[PDB]
Amino acid sequence: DLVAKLRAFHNEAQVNPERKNLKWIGLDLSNGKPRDNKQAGVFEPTIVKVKSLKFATEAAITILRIDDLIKLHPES
């Protein structure tokens, strides 16, 4: 329900030009309800999200590229 409410709020923000203030709505974990996180003072550096996305995408691409494994038995 919480994720559905977040998605509904963000969909309203994206499709309604006059409701663009809903972009800041995040999760209020103490009460379990959506909350304006920009007004609540919940901030993160943009570089954190950007680098997380880039590194995660590269790692997923690297692992996904594999389709066969050869595991040589140890010589010892």
């Binding site: 690297t62 594999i66 389709d67 066969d68 494994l69 050869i70 040589l72 038995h73 010589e75």
Partner: protein
């Protein structure tokens, strides 16, 4: 005339067949990684080194 050389020894034929089978096995093993749609292979050595 009729029959020619008997070719009593069968080892050369077996050796040729084994060599061909090994080469074909290697080719079939590496066929999957050919072309733009071919995917990479992952090889782990006895020492534990991993290469993709």
């Amino acid at each position: 005339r009729g029959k020619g050389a008997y070719q009593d020894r069968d080892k050369p034929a077996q050796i040729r067949f084994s060599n061909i089978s090994a080469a074909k096995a290697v080719a079939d093993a590496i066929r999957t990684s050919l072309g733009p749609k071919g995917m990479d292979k992952m090889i782990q050595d006895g020492k534990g080194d991993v290469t993709i």
